[PDB]
Amino acid sequence: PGRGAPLAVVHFRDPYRYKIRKELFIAPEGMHTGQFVYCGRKATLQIGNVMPLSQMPEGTIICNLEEKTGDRGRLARTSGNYATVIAHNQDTKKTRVKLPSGAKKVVPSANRAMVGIVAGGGRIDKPILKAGRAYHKYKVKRNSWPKVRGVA
Amino acid sequence: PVVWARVMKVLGRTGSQGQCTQVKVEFLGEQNRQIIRNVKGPVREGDILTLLESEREARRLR
Amino acid sequence: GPQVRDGEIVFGVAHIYASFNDTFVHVTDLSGRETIARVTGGMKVKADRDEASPYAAMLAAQDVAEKCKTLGITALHIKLRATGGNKTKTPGPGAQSALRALARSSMKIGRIEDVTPIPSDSTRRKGGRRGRRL
Amino acid sequence: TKKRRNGGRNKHNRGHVKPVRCTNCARCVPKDKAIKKFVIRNIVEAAAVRDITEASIWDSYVLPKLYAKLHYCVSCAIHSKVVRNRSREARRIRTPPLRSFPKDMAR
Amino acid sequence: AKRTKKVGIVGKYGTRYGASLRKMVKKMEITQHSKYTCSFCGKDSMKRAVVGIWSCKRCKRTVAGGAWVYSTTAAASVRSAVRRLRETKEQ
Amino acid sequence: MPLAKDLLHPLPAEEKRKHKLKRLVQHPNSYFMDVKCPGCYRITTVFSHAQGVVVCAGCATILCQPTGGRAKLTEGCSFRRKPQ
Amino acid sequence: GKKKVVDPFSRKDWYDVKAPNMFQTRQIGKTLVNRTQGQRIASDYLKGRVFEVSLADLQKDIDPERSFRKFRLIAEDVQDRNVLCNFHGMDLTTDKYRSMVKKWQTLIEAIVEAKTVDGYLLRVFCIGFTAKDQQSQRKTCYAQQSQVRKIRARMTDIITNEVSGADLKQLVNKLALDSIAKDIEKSCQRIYPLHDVYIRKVKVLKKPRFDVSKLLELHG
RNA sequence: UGGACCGUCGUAAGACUAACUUAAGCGAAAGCAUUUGCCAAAGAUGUUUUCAUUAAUCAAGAACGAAAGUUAGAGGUUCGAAGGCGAUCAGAUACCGCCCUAGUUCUAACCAUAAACGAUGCCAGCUAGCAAUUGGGUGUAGCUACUUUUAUGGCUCUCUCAGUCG
């Protein structure tokens, strides 16, 4: 509550300790519960796994893109959009990408992302239609005003 | 611009206001160039003629 | 034995271009990057109509032949451009006349081709379905 | 005031078919009812042929010609004297005549 | 009888908000909270929770999908797009 | 003659090339033949335009060629134009 | 700006071009390259040069008749103003192209891409034509959309025999005589009479690496 | 002004799928052209298959109809009503140019009209040739092809139905 997007609750068995360790992804599309996710450079491409860019070709779409390899996914995750890559380059390990802006820019390649479109769209095409729902649309996202103009 | 061109064969004109004999002439040192030139005024067959422009003849098909 | 003659035997490219309303004499490298003697008929007669004349094409063909010999070029190749897409696709009247002053200058040349742009399929002319009503 | 029998060209069991524009007017017309002259025209216009034989690198290179199927509309035909004005009866043949010489503009 | 004449399920929200804004929620709420054939449970037991988060009520499989239909036509196209492409990389 | 007096008695061979249907009576060009496949010996009767794969009970050599017309077997057949 | 008072072509120097070894001799002329500087390095501008030559220049065609096989070449590296000038394609001119299509026909077009013994990815453009049988007054000699599409399938398995077919050190020698243009008739004539037929263009879109060890053997 | 237009490789980018194109064909009509796979459906000959009149056409009526053109959501190349500007003209608000704007684009639908024309509704029968050509059959007492004389295959002739053109 505060998103529009749905989350994804998932856990793992540690390569080092004895316990389970619970994490929270952003929902790839078609994620049934009980799906077997995979996270690795050797992990083959199937939605919605998480794999680095150097092992998928162009033409695929992804979500939860990471720019700086380690900072775990700060790009293009919100509802109804899709992280894309349309360029590979084996010179100094480069792969250009198109954000949902349309302005296409360059990222490094060793970083990770989750393959496929991300769930939630499209919550602009249903008009909220009254001043009670778009109260609650800003009940728990921020506290803007139901905003008040300038010229009075 | 100093070559002289002798006539071999004659054809008609787009005459009315400037009758100019579209006419088949060849040179002497350049006698292999039988370029079909356009002389203004009456010309008998067998006349060598001077010339300065020795490039083209503004061809229209006839 | 295997003795090729000195005097810098080379085959340049003409890239002779002609059209209605212009003729272009654009000689370059055989690879095609470096360009020598770009000058054409558009810098010959100041009339804004007579730059389609074969006379101006001849003056565009008078000058370009001798500057090949200033660097020792004695031979070249000849390409043709239309440059029609949905446009003309057929060479202008000054096209065939332009090679004559090249031919009547004792320049030994054999290669005659067109790179006249034949598209895969048309991409729309200008004028729109009732074009150019004279 | 119907004069042609079938009409234009080639509309047997189809309806309405592919157009492409004319070159010298580009009144965009269907591919059947537009005059379609096809020409293999020569490069030097048969006059510089004696000049290129002297300037050839090889034995005359022997000269190619151009190939492009041009497409004319109706007033383009009549405003260049392509095909015009037979009788009320002399519009009833297609296949003849030339009868005299190997046709020019090729040449 | 044919109870209303056009509007159907937005008839709660009547005489309000406009003409072609009463219609635009029709075309997006005759799909939402109708029942769907579950791809796993086989039956027709699909209602919503919030945006894009459907569950069944039978056999407890829950699947994330589209937000006004069960899964969009944008989505399975991608599920078809990564399908044909996956056999090209390692093979 | 276009204004002919005899239609009851036409010439035979032109009727043989007229049609399978438009004759004075109705009988097709088709018949039955008794094919022996050349690698075997067994007797089998089959239609001309059989439109169906036939083999014997134990002699499945060729016996047919799949087509829309008559079963055109080249050098793999032996039969007769005869009611058996 | 620069303001050179005389002869920009003075710095443009005569640089020779050298063929590969297997065709013929290597001197097919010169190129004009600007003289280098410390930051302006003229050797690395030769890599941006795409070069053109015909088989008449590389198989001593005195009367130009087989000159329709026009070869694209790529200048890749130099030594002592002598470029190695690797292959970059082999197209057809428009002269031999447009002369074939006398309307009255059904062409046989086929496009196929494949990977070689080496790391190249060629693009083969199989273009066929129908041969008129004798004693025939019918002015069509047409193919009936299975008489092409099976013939279209007939060439695509032929060409992949030659993509694993001893590449550019040996492959273009099979394209010099065009033995691939010979044997396809004997397969096509089992279905349909085949007229003139060519490949008309090849493409070199995945030249993988320089590989100078066999390439100095190619410059042998 | 110094780098257009030009030559050249290269990156995208969206539209179009020319040539081959026909007095071709498929479709009920509008319309309908890259390959190849897929998923279908129809027509024609083939048929000593089955069925037993299941029929023809049709008010009311239900599917389908290029644009033009609207309703939100994409994506932007050529082009482009409208709008500005140069000429031309007596005037041009136009015929010609330059720029882009609606939009053509593909997805979701919505009107349903066109000279939507072969200015001729559909189904049964007869009456005339001649010549093309599409498919399917059939006869070569045909050649050609070499896998071999063959074989499948091509063309030619003969016959044939549906024709459609002339």
Swiss-Prot record, chain A:
Location within or outside the cell: Cytoplasm
Q: Which GO terms describe its molecular function?
A: RNA binding; rRNA binding; structural constituent of ribosome
Q: Which residues form the signal peptide?
A: none
Keyword list, A-Z = Cytoplasm, Ribonucleoprotein, Ribosomal protein, RNA-binding, rRNA-binding
A cellular component term (GO) from this record? nucleolus
**GO annotation terms (biological process):** cytoplasmic translation
- Superkingdom of this protein's organism: Eukaryota
Q: In which tissues is it expressed?
A: In larvae tissues examined: gut, brain imaginal disk, salivary glands, fat body, muscles, epidermis and trachaea.
Tell me the protein family, please.
Belongs to the universal ribosomal protein uL2 family.
| Protein name from the UniProt record | Large ribosomal subunit protein uL2
Segment of the intact protein contained: 52 to 203 of 256
Curated annotation (Swiss-Prot), chain D:
- One of this protein's Pfam families, by short name? Ribosomal_S26e
One MF term in the entry's GO annotations: structural constituent of ribosome
Disordered: annotated span = 86-107
Asked if the Swiss-Prot or TrEMBL record annotates the protein with the keyword Ribosomal protein, the reply is: yes
Keyword annotations for this protein, in alphabetical order, are: Cytoplasm, Endoplasmic reticulum, Ribonucleoprotein, Ribosomal protein
The family database entries (Gene3D superfamilies) matched by this protein are listed as:
Ribosomal protein S26e
Any idea where this protein resides? Cytoplasm, Cytosol; Cytoplasm; Rough endoplasmic reticulum
List the PROSITE patterns: RIBOSOMAL_S26E
| Disulfide pairings | none
Q: Please provide, in alphabetical order, the Gene Ontology terms of the cellular component aspect for this entry.
A: cytoplasmic side of rough endoplasmic reticulum membrane; cytosolic ribosome; cytosolic small ribosomal subunit; ribosome
Biological process GO annotation list? cytoplasmic translation
Q: Per its UniProt record, what PANTHER family does this chain match?
A: 40S RIBOSOMAL PROTEIN S26
Q: How does it assemble?
A: Component of the 40S small ribosomal subunit.
Membership in a protein family: Belongs to the eukaryotic ribosomal protein eS26 family.
Protein name (database record): Small ribosomal subunit protein eS26
Swiss-Prot record, chain E:
Q: Name one GO molecular function term.
A: structural constituent of ribosome
Q: Does the keyword Ribonucleoprotein apply?
A: yes
User: Which Pfam families does the record associate with it?
Assistant: Ribosomal_L37ae
Q: Which GO terms describe its cellular component?
A: cytosolic large ribosomal subunit; cytosolic ribosome
Biological process (GO) annotations held by this record are: cytoplasmic translation
Q: Which family does it belong to?
A: Belongs to the eukaryotic ribosomal protein eL43 family.
Protein name as annotated = Large ribosomal subunit protein eL43
Zinc fingers, C4-type, are found at 38-59
Q: Does the keyword Ribonucleoprotein apply?
A: yes
Q: Do you know which HAMAP family this protein is assigned to? A: Ribosomal_eL43 (MF_00327)
Q: What is the scientific name of the source organism?
A: Drosophila melanogaster (Fruit fly)
The organism's place on the tree of life at top rank: Eukaryota
- Which ranges of the sequence are coiled-coil? none
Q: Which UniProt keywords apply?
A: Metal-binding, Ribonucleoprotein, Ribosomal protein, Zinc, Zinc-finger
InterPro entries in alphabetical order:
Ribosomal_eL37/eL43, Ribosomal_eL43, Ribosomal_protein_eL43, Ribosomal_zn-bd
UniProtKB/Swiss-Prot annotation, chain G:
Null mutant phenotype reads:
Flies exhibit disappearance of the follicular cells of the ovary and abnormalities of the associated germline derivatives, leading to failure of egg production.
Q: Which domain of life is it from?
A: Eukaryota
Q: What does the record list as GO biological process?
A: cytoplasmic translation; oogenesis
Keyword list, A-Z = Cytoplasm, Developmental protein, Differentiation, Oogenesis, Ribonucleoprotein, Ribosomal protein
The Gene Ontology CC terms held by the record are: cytosol; cytosolic ribosome; cytosolic small ribosomal subunit
GO MF assignments: structural constituent of ribosome
The coiled-coil segments of this chain are none
Q: Subcellular location, in the record's words?
A: Cytoplasm
Task: Please give the start and end residues of each transmembrane region.
Answer: none
Q: Respond yes or no to whether keyword Ribonucleoprotein is given for this record.
A: yes
Could you tell me in which tissues this protein is expressed?
Ubiquitously expressed in stage 8 embryos. During oogenesis, expression is located basally in somatic follicular epithelium and in the oocyte at the later stages.
Subunit structure of this chain's protein: Component of the small ribosomal subunit. Mature ribosomes consist of a small (40S) and a large (60S) subunit. The 40S subunit contains about 33 different proteins and 1 molecule of RNA (18S). The 60S subunit contains about 49 different proteins and 3 molecules of RNA (28S, 5.8S and 5S).
Its function, per the record, reads: Essential for oogenesis; required for late follicle cell development.
Report the family membership.
Answer: Belongs to the eukaryotic ribosomal protein eS1 family.
Q: What is this protein called?
A: Small ribosomal subunit protein eS1
- Relative to the complete UniProt sequence, the shown stretch is 17 to 236 of 268
